[PDB]
Amino acid sequence: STLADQALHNNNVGPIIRAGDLVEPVIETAEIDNPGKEITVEDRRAYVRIAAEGELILTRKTLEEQLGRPFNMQELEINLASFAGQIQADEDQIRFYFDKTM
Amino acid sequence: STLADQALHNNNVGPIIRAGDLVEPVIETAEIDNPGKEITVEDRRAYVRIAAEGELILTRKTLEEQLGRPFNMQELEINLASFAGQIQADEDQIRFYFDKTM
Amino acid sequence: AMHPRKDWYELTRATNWTPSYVTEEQLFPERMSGHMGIPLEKWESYDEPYKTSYPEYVSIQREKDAGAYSVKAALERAKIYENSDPGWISTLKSHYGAIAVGEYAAVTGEGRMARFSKAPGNRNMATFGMMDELRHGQLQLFFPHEYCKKDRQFDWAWRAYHSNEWAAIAAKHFFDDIITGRDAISVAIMLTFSFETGFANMQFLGLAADAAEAGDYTFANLISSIQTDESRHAQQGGPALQLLIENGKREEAQKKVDMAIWRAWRLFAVLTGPVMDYYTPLEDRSQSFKEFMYEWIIGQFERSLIDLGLDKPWYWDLFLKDIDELHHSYHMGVWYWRTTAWWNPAAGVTPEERDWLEEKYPGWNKRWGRCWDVITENVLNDRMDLVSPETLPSVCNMSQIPLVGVPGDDWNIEVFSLEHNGRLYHFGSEVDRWVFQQDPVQYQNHMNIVDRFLAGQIQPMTLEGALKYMGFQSIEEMGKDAHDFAWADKC
Amino acid sequence: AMHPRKDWYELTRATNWTPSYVTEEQLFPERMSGHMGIPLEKWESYDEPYKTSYPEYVSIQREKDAGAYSVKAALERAKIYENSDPGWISTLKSHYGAIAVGEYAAVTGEGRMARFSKAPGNRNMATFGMMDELRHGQLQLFFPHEYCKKDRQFDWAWRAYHSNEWAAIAAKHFFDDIITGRDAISVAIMLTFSFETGFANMQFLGLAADAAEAGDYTFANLISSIQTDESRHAQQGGPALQLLIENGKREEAQKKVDMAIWRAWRLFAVLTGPVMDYYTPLEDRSQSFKEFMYEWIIGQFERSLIDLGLDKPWYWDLFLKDIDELHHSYHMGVWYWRTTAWWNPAAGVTPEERDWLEEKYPGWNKRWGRCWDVITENVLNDRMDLVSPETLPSVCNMSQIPLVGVPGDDWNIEVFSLEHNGRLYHFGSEVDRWVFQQDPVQYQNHMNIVDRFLAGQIQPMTLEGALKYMGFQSIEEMGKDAHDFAWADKC
């Protein structure tokens, strides 16, 4: 159908953050670390779906700044309940991305 | 007054446990470790006032049994929000007690 | 000083070797490993994209549980059990029953990979996977255990998988087919690309949204914490799938993923569908079941599968039609046969609810509404014999769930049958029949509960005999209308 | 193996020595130490009955905060700010304002003991006391900080103690008299036996009961966790008191404890009294203020003081009468002068509330009810000029709170005045005057806010000038009726 085709033919990538202290810092980090991208946010109370088109990076350094306390990248898994896109993650950042353009 | 005299002339001693996982285990421990005493319980939702007349002992061993997981005595301070009586506390138990009979 | 994980990580997965005292096939037998003949050396390019390491794991998971348990302790006295709508309490009972001991079974799918996968990074990530599923099984037993003293139906958080109750058989048939009953590489692509990145998000995050609206933060906080582990260990799938595609097994991988998605769909349509659109109080429905399906399964999950190189499944258009229809009938089946459930289904058909159903599914009132009209009028007139069944539904030989269709003004129902080795089987879709024909040795001598009833295995051969066979131990345990029919007063 | 605390604990407090290069009195000057001439050796029998040690402290306090912060994070979206009654939100604003930076001041009372107490066990327990009060100040700044973006009144969680707002001066006069303004041994018996084992239980556990009824578990969980630390460090009092009694200072100890209890009583009657009996929604009032007073202050606290060897204070019967009366007038003062508060007081006088007040305080309607009748009729007739003041209340020279009495059918008001060094002072009770006369150098040249107004220090000398002097930075910050007078519709 039209509704389903449109839903499937998206290129949205990014984190789903569960309710807690990482929601606003991640939204802010997504905005700062992807300045050429529009960041969209869907708030479902128990979680927030944060996305950009094609690629969305969260750097540890920016997230630590926005969270306001010392932060390692691996700790994001306490609050990363899901994500859209493929993931590449290291000590410095997490990258959500797609290989294809749909 | 009569109401105030009666309120002051009590010999109730024992723990006030804040809402959480220690409430039922402490009530049970108070009953088991003070078998000659009537244990009274006043539930104020955010805390529970547990008392006996003159003396109330909580042993670590019994509390560990009733809590169902390994437990040190010092950990009770996570949930001991107040207490009636004087206190004597060591690695094996906590004793709430009065020197005087009012 | 400490050295950064990137500099020593490769040594943690430099664990393949060339066997000499037994053969490669003896060490990794195809029936347990599922390597499809792909030689050991090829599996060494497997690269898990969501890594962890032992010291970080134990520290990070210590923190996850400290939060989950603290929240539970701080809210024991929020009155959820006492102030909650009974439809919400039934949602908890069906979730814990259908999930807790299945999570513990998932330890065995991860263990299958930890021992039998030829990819060293998969064996290590599956070791953390084993630990994660242990966490999940233990949390989802510990959390409902406090409610045993309130209601015997909470015993089914532990008991369901030990029973022959029909929804428990549906869950076990799915879990055992996709997770515990197949080789390591099949688990790697079937479990990760049906439940873990797919339907788990419906039951553990879509439902968490409704739980938060309903003010049940112990539960929302629990299930979204559980999904954080899933989102890490599910990433064992992508590299396995990529390796299969690289080594000429695209066809086989596509078929396994197509099969697993459909199997998961049918089970979560009966679990999650009635929860989202009927049991959850109307004011707490963050989105409808279909809206959540379009967010999680179409928009996120299926799009990810295309990105990794698979095609849309062949049954795409059948699936889209099913999302508009199937769970409305499964809800009606579970509610009309509520006495066979271990939870108390909410009918969810007060006028205000039917208006919402019509908005979310135009045409609803001329279809399922026709059936609910009959039921509602019987309740209003106290003809309660007519609101309880006196026979069994016919059940799918794949999903183990009643055979349904669209009722009312444009009635349409189809059973897809199959003769095989001298036996007549019945399926609830083209796809379910197709799944059977892919792997008949997996399924062929399984008997569904109605097969068992007709074969003399359920004595006495009556509804009451079937209930006893299903493992009910007291009258209190069988399902009743969540609100004791108080909803008809709004009708 | 590890050796048990009992076997090495004495060495942790074997820290007294005989000074040789400076004198004992130089090292422990009476004005900072408060030893009352009791020689060093006598203080070595001090034995804290609620011990801890460094490794246990950091582990146990790590756990306390992990719980407190996890609960806060899990509930950010429970809608307390959004779904709560505004009387409840005002309770949060007045608590954090009146308490957070006072907790941080309490670090200095503990530091006074850590350096200047002659008892080695007191210096170590006070070191943990310093840490505990740091915790308390930081938690009670961090928690309200998220609400700065909702309402400028939450700025006063940080700002109040930096202002000259009248309730902030009342808090600071109490804190600075009992905690930061006296020698170590005075802190040891005054702070522990007025606030920490006394009135803290009203504001941190009695209020937690109401918070839990109101569904504000972040706050209930926070303040009851804070009280767990209090219940440990307050046990520095008992051994100090015992040592004073043993060494012939019973009289002095009794006077200090009698003074501190009365000072704390007056401040918590204005803070906690209106919260419990008016701002907290009726359905959430676990007990009345008086019932909580009889539980915590009479039944538990005063009984403990008798057990430790003190007598009932001389003003016992005055105190008992005050518990029936004082806070009803303080509430009325805070509400009528709401524009001078940094929170929005709830009137709390709908008919259903007045019925509860009459049950909890027989005679209420013929006393305070007479005043509320006038106010209610003015609101109903939209004579709003008559519901806002055009002058200042007269204020106590001890408690810094308005001079009040019983209104209505058996009107009774008494000001206890005193000439001293050529100045006329006014007090709100016999006891407050008595406290002044015990230690005039502590108080004599202090000027209360009305003294300052009459002396030209507040310019312009108008209500608006006083509000600016009180540190209000915007119209939004000044108190208004919590419900915008919507309550009169129930009248």
Place this chain on the structure above:
Amino acid sequence: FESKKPMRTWSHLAEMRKKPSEYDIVSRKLHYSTNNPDSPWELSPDSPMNLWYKQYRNASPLKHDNWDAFTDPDQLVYRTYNLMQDGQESYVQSLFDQFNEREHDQMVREGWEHTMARCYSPLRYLFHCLQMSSAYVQQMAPASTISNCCILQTADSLRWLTHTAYRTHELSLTYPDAGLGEHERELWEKEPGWQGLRELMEKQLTAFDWGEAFVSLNLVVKPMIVESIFKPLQQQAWENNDTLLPLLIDSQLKDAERHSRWSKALVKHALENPDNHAVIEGWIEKWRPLADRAAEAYLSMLSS
């Protein structure tokens, strides 16, 4: 159908006289796959995995009428395991940090880097084999309380593997010309001192009966590793001024002792059935020679 009141715990625990513990509540009687002898799994009774389980679990010569009654003597659950191991592992990671600050590795006796490259860094293969093997006993064992001990033992095996990986890399930074992190696979495959161990593990990994797998792994292979690999390495480290390796191995030995404790409790439970003494002893005697040979070959490499 009768009427029954709510129970204070799970129906299977409700007759206990004691209040059920966290361990009891979350660990006991979770393998539904043992309920139906002809259908472990809810599939065709002769599905491939059903046939595997009927052959290698149900038909094992090691037999007991109530495997579920087995109790981990340590009563560990996931929550308390991670508390315990975050403590121990934080401690080890702090040792690594401080000994690196002190340049410990520079001060080891001349040549010790070569002994570590030959005798220590290929242990990552041995420890991974213990990880694989423990995961197999997990998935086959006939009671969830047994399988839980195995899950935790699988995780401990990976703990040891990861220590070895970290230290192999770290040692290579001080000693870049000893093959550290480069030749371990070839040593494991072709060095004589490793071949006894490699034969032992390749054969043990193909012992598919659950009881044989358990006995060979936990009663024969793992006690040999303690006596003949861990303890002799501590002694060699002492002779060679490596003061880190003995502390690291002492932490790994706490895990090893824990594995022995639960194993011995399972043997005790098993022996309630008199027939099991012969079955366990038979398997011990079958596997002991291969384990003895593995130990001797390793020790001759270590002392050479």
Place this chain on the structure above:
Amino acid sequence: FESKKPMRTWSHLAEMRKKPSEYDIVSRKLHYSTNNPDSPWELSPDSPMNLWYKQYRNASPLKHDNWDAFTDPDQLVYRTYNLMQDGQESYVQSLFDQFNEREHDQMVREGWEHTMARCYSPLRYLFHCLQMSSAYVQQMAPASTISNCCILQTADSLRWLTHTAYRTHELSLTYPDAGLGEHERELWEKEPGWQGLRELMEKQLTAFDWGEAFVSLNLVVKPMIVESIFKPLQQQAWENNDTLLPLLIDSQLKDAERHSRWSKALVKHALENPDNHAVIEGWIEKWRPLADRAAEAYLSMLSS
């Protein structure tokens, strides 16, 4: 009165260009006692404590127009201090456990128990004096960010005291005839090697100006303890086969370095006011001879 919208943080932070950190939110500008020069505390302006604060805080020769702008370079708050120190202290307690299992104390060089009894176990008095002194700088310092560093330093001093108490007791179990846990007060009072230190601390504890207290404690006494007590004890322990004491002291030195870091940052902040260079140097020169004498007397006792 104008209308103003809500602010994203406290009014005093709302002009920051950066988002305020946890540290900023909970630590900054909390001493209301510096607001009113003639009335620190909300009492009679000439109450005894008001006179104390006007003399020993407000009138200090060390001056700055914005002490509140001082920032702990480590930006510690209560929460992150206990996380950090639970890690370090768990590590030390694990060392104590393992070294006790190994009977470490039995293997120290002959006579080392006497050196520990004379030179180590009376440190509990020295460390308690640092605890008392740090608590004094806390209560007098003119900014909450300064006082917070002092609270944490007071707690670290008690950490060190408690290590010393625990080890004194533990050593006495192996060596019950050396006076361990019995004579430390008499040594502190009457042994020459302790008298330089005891004089230093009794005089430092009676330096009541906040600035003089800070400089004497943190710029003179505490760096001397690092160079002349901690490090020489590590060296003596090495010569005497005590391998525990150097690891314990390395943990205590992490705390000591942290105290130096915040101190040096306060000096840097102070020196924005050119007049403070002379004031700080004057106090350093006043106290250095007493500290040098204390170090020399201790070191002559340690090497005797």
Place this chain on the structure above:
Amino acid sequence: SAFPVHAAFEKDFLVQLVVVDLNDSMDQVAEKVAYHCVNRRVAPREGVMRVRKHRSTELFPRDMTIAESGLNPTEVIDVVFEE
């Protein structure tokens, strides 16, 4: 004797097990199926109930018995109203 079929009734939402008898007419079969559907989830209506093999076009004659029909036990039938 007992003859189990799976039956789908017109306008209902599911297929149910209905046990009929070998010598029942199609009329009698229709009534046995209707008992479990009409006035439970399906509105009663005028008209003649007919039996067919599932999704078939051809109706069985009303007076035909289940033995005469060639149906096998557990086959699926529909019960529908004459058009």
Place this chain on the structure above:
Amino acid sequence: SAFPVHAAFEKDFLVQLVVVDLNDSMDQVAEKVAYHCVNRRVAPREGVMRVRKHRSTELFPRDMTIAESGLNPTEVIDVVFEE
């Protein structure tokens, strides 16, 4: 000129600052105090308002001025109704 007193009005709940004038009569003082009390928290009533030193028995004469009375600034007065 300005003369501050602290005044307690009959049936009110508090003492307030009221600034009166040195040459005000007791009648005028009573009215200035009443402005801040009557119809705000105290029901209006018939009768004559009188001024006295706080808790005193003796009333000041109605036409007596504050200068004539011997009151000092910031002393406490009651305003009460003639009995």
